[PDB]
Design a protein around this ligand. Structure first.
Ligand SMILES: CCCCCCCC/C=C/CCCCCCCC(=O)O[C@@H](COC(=O)CCCCCCCCCCCCCCC)COP(=O)([O-])OCC[N+](C)(C)C
Ligand SMILES: CCCCCCCC/C=C\CCCCCCCC(=O)O[C@@H](COC(=O)CCCCCCCCCCCCCCC)COP(=O)([O-])OCC[N+](C)(C)C
Ligand SMILES: CCCCCCCC/C=C\CCCCCCCC(=O)O[C@@H](COC(=O)CCCCCCCCCCCCCCC)COP(=O)([O-])OCC[N+](C)(C)C
Ligand SMILES: CCCCCCCC/C=C\CCCCCCCC(=O)O[C@@H](COC(=O)CCCCCCCCCCCCCCC)COP(=O)([O-])OCC[N+](C)(C)C
Ligand SMILES: CCCCCCCC/C=C\CCCCCCCC(=O)O[C@@H](COC(=O)CCCCCCCCCCCCCCC)COP(=O)([O-])OCC[N+](C)(C)C
Ligand SMILES: CCCCCCCC/C=C\CCCCCCCC(=O)O[C@@H](COC(=O)CCCCCCCCCCCCCCC)COP(=O)([O-])OCC[N+](C)(C)C
Ligand SMILES: CCCCCCCC/C=C\CCCCCCCC(=O)O[C@@H](COC(=O)CCCCCCCCCCCCCCC)COP(=O)([O-])OCC[N+](C)(C)C
Ligand SMILES: CCCCCCCC/C=C\CCCCCCCC(=O)O[C@@H](COC(=O)CCCCCCCCCCCCCCC)COP(=O)([O-])OCC[N+](C)(C)C
Ligand SMILES: *[C@@H]1O[C@H](CO)[C@@H](O[C@@H]2O[C@H](CO)[C@@H](O)[C@H](O)[C@H]2NC(C)=O)[C@H](O)[C@H]1NC(C)=O
Ligand SMILES: *[C@@H]1O[C@H](CO)[C@@H](O[C@@H]2O[C@H](CO)[C@@H](O)[C@H](O)[C@H]2NC(C)=O)[C@H](O)[C@H]1NC(C)=O
Ligand code: NA
Ligand code: NA
Ligand code: NA
Ligand code: NA
Lengths: 303, 115, 101, 51, 51
């Protein structure tokens, strides 16, 4: 039901009752649809328009689903209904086969979360952080914003969102549904060799690393003339490209696009199961209606 | 971020004024202060936009014009439903004796149910 | 009859039509839902056999040295420590340095 | 064949994707700190942007 | 109405009226498509077409 954006599924359904009920109005008002269902004689005054309101839906649904119907009208005022409702079908059914061809061969996996703010609204994701590192000292002193509300999450459910190290949680996020708050240098390192774990969001903090130096030294005036020298020639970037590269994952292959199983479409074994049970109930429901008529016909009602 | 230059509180030709600031500016960097002020002048309208993408998932914006031609295809059914009703009424008035008063009687006949 | 009930069971699934055309409400829903079971299956078949034959047409065998650099599945192979790796270890073209990686 | 063509295309998201777009012309501030990084780069992705 | 150009849609509708009229000519002209629609009482000389 995905490839047509359910505004259209509600408009077509309200047009399958729309053009259907107008075709009931046009037929009974037109003279040519008053013909005989018994053409063996000239007439037995049995001249009767075929289009009942049950048959009015039947040319509606029967033409929308390409199978046809039994009526196939005769009057020119009921051909123009039959000439446009058919052309209403060959675009809706030929955009359904168009989009569902274009959603199986080219798929783009949309993430439900894109930042630290869109992640904040959904408490079903079980955020977590690395307990007693450098990250927990940021959210403990956080009296800023949204991130203060995320502190109320972690203090409520400790020993389950406070993984004792980096490596144990990467095993945890690979199994469970989890979303780290850790260093964006290690996240750039994990996502290149373990390609199931991408970096959503961006920068929240900027500490920045740096070469250490004892208290008072003439080194640091010549260290910074060497580090800033390496930023400008790109040597500090080409070494950064060299170590964090690893394997790399050009994951675009589309994967034989899809051998389509129950996992994609299984609702048409549900709407089939929830359709036939609805007709068993109306079978008994009109079976009592004939008994309701037979209650009034001879003398007897329930026996 | 292609480059990683970074701004800085400047300090004159070699002087210990860098040492009282590099201490004191890291207290503003770690607590909240360089995010409370960065979101005080780089705020903007806070403009929400695009609901980001529908992206070829056809809605009313593309194939919605067939509901124009389905609306236009039923207007030409009603105006011809008068035309068939006027065509036999002009024919039947020629047949027996009588005028357009029986054309309303033809509406009085065809307003009935399944006969 | 049961001989004709397969006929609406087969003919409605293959879109060629039928011969029965049910005439009352308790057989209009089964006659109606089964039509919607066809138009999803047959348009998840035409809309998926298109999606095989445009996937294995977008793919193509490697034709150059930069295309093989984007193929981490196919492992490179070379003669070891010879004149071939001599060109690759001192290259600064950075397309062949990716092949050295 | 329309709705799988305008789904394969996507707006540019990086600096190497814009290097493959010779239709969209680059633009920069002239002779300043921005072109200073681009004229001495040996990354050869940004040297293509300098070209 | 985009995946066919406005030269095809102008010709398809002009091929619809081009085959609706020619099939109207041939069906009247042909001898076999004359038939009585009343086989319930056959041999009636009430020959009519569906055309
Ligand atoms: C075998 C016989 C086949 C006949 C097929 C005929 C197809 C005709 C094709 C002609 C091609 C000409 C090219 C341009 C025409 C534009 C059409 C269009 O897009 O919509 C136009 C109207 O829509 C209609 O034209 C009427 C269609 C509905 C009724 C058709 C019943 C057919 C019954 C057959 C019995 C004969 C009776 C009909 C005789 C013609 C106008 O749309 P718009 O202006 O964009 O609306 C926006 C206005 N606004 C911007 C101010 C809001
Ligand atoms: C009839 C109109 C179409 C249906 C009405 C809606 C249109 C309104 C538009 C939008 C509103 C939609 C929201 C409704 C949500 C309620 C739940 C629901 O129904 O879905 C449930 C079942 O699905 C069904 O059972 C319904 C379909 C079968 C019955 C109707 C057709 C039968 C014949 C019609 C007779 C009348 C003939 C009419 C002729 C024109 C979903 O199943 P589930 O158990 O949740 O599985 C979830 C599994 N999962 C967790 C893995 C994901
Ligand atoms: C989850 C469980 C839910 C279900 C169970 C719930 C448990 C409750 C238990 C039981 C309740 C269920 C009772 C069964 C309902 C239908 C009974 C029936 O068939 O009789 C009638 C309705 O069938 C029709 O044909 C509909 C249209 C009526 C035709 C014109 C009559 C007045 C129209 C105005 C109103 C119409 C509707 C207005 C808009 C709605 C038969 O009609 P007909 O005239 O003999 O048909 C002629 C057919 N022909 C054309 C081939 C000649
Ligand atoms: C009495 C006779 C029978 C009439 C009724 C039949 C019963 C059944 C009929 C229809 C049933 C199903 C359809 C109803 C659903 C809503 C329609 C819709 O989606 O809007 C569409 C119409 O597009 C426009 O709004 C553009 C302007 C239209 C101006 C008038 C159109 C008539 C054209 C000339 C007419 C004369 C032709 C003469 C030719 C010679 C698109 O909408 P949108 O604006 O793009 O944006 C979405 C807005 N929305 C979310 C609210 C939708
Ligand atoms: C926006 C306002 C509305 C638009 C204005 C629309 C203008 C007016 C629109 C349509 C005009 C007619 C409307 C009412 C009549 C119904 C038509 C019909 O039944 O066909 C009849 C032909 O007509 C004849 O009776 C024989 C004369 C031939 C007429 C020209 C050829 C028809 C071509 C196409 C018609 C025009 C197509 C369009 C042309 C451009 C069929 O013959 P019959 O004699 O009925 O059969 C025996 C009768 N009996 C079975 C009971 C025994
Ligand atoms: C399109 C319409 C939808 C439904 C269609 C019909 C239902 C579906 C029919 C069968 C279901 C298949 C079982 C599933 C197994 C899948 C394996 C397979 O691919 O083919 C298998 C079955 O081969 C066939 O299917 C032959 C076709 C059956 C013809 C009879 C249908 C006519 C019914 C009307 C009669 C009228 C009755 C009377 C009426 C009054 C064998 O192939 P394989 O050896 O496994 O090859 C493996 C190759 N591989 C490894 C590379 C993959
Ligand atoms: C191409 C065909 C042309 C049009 C066809 C006809 C037009 C109308 C057809 C469909 C109208 C649907 C309107 C809204 C769209 C569904 C949205 C939804 O929430 O569904 C939900 C409930 O809804 C259901 O379970 C009902 C399923 C709809 C199919 C109706 C079949 C009835 C046949 C009609 C004729 C009967 C014949 C009777 C004869 C007298 C189920 O999905 P979900 O639980 O939300 O799953 C979540 C996953 N997700 C988030 C990714 C979604
Ligand atoms: C009793 C009635 C009998 C007739 C039936 C009438 C109903 C149906 C009739 C036609 C359907 C619709 C009519 C117009 C569309 C036709 C094609 C067209 O687009 O125009 C064409 C111009 O060609 C002309 O200008 C000739 C126009 C004369 C009309 C009949 C010619 C065909 C018959 C004799 C045929 C002889 C061929 C050999 C046969 C073995 C355009 O050229 P093209 O062909 O589209 O493209 C090829 C050119 N290209 C490759 C460079 C691009
Ligand atoms: C595709 O991604 C889904 C993401 O949900 C994976 O589903 C998870 O699988 C693990 C198995 O190790 C379960 O423990 C989780 O509960 C699943 N997540 C759910 C159900 O939300 C799935 O394994 C992935 N498939 C492949 C082949 O990689
Ligand atoms: C999630 O992680 C990866 C990503 O698909 C899956 O296993 C990896 O498979 C690739 C090859 O495609 C190997 O290079 C990696 O070494 C594999 N990593 C691991 C950890 O197995 C893995 O199956 C996915 N699903 C789950 C449930 O973990
Ligand atoms: Na396709
Ligand atoms: Na068909
Ligand atoms: Na048929
Ligand atoms: Na098709």
């Amino acid at each position: 039901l995905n490839p047509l954006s359910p505004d259209i599924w509600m408009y077509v359904l309200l047009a399958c009752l729309g053009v259907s009920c107008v075709l009931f109005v046009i037929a009974r008002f037109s003279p040519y649809e008053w013909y005989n269902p018994h053409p063996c004689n000239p007439d037995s005054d049995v001249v009767e328009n075929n289009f009942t309101l049950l048959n009015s839906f039947w040319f509606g649904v029967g033409a929308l689903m390409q199978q046809g119907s039994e009526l196939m009208p005769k009057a020119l005022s009921t051909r123009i209904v039959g000439g446009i409702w058919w052309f209403f079908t060959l675009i809706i059914i030929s955009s359904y086969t168009a989009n569902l061809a274009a959603f199986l061969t080219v798929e783009r996996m949309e993430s439900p979360i894109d930042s630290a703010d869109d992640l904040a609204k959904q408490t079903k994701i079980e955020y977590g952080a690395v307990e007693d590192g450098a990250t927990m000292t940021f959210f403990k002193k956080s009296k800023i914003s949204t991130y203060d509300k995320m502190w109320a999450f972690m203090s409520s459910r400790r020993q389950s969102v406070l993984v004792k190290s980096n490596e144990e949680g990467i095993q945890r996020v690979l199994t469970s549904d989890y979303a780290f708050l850790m260093e964006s240098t290690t996240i750039e390192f994990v996502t290149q060799r373990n390609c199931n774990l991408t970096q959503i969001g961006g920068l929240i903090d900027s500490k920045g690393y740096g070469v250490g130096t004892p208290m008072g030294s003439p080194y640091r005036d010549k260290i910074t003339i060497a580090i800033l020298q390496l930023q400008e020639e790109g040597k500090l970037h080409m070494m950064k490209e060299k170590w964090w590269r690893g394997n790399g994952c050009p994951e675009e292959e589309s994967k034989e696009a899809s051998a389509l199983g129950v996992q994609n479409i299984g609702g048409i074994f549900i709407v089939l199961a929830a359709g036939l049970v609805l007709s068993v109930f109306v079978a008994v429901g009109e079976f009592l209606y004939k008994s309701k008529k037979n209650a009034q016909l001879e003398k007897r009602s329930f026996c | 971020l292609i480059d990683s230059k970074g701004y800085g509180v400047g300090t004159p030709m070699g002087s210990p004024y860098r040492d009282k600031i590099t201490i004191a500016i890291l207290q503003l960097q770690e607590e909240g202060k360089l995010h409370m002020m960065k979101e005080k002048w780089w705020r903007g309208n806070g403009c929400p936009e695009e609901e980001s993408k529908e992206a070829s998932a056809l809605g009313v914006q593309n194939i919605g014009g067939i509901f124009i031609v389905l609306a236009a295809g039923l207007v030409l059914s009603v105006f011809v439903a008068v035309g068939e009703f006027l065509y036999k009424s002009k024919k039947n008035a020629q047949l027996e004796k009588r005028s357009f008063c029986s054309a309303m009687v033809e509406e009085l006949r065809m307003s009935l149910k399944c006969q």
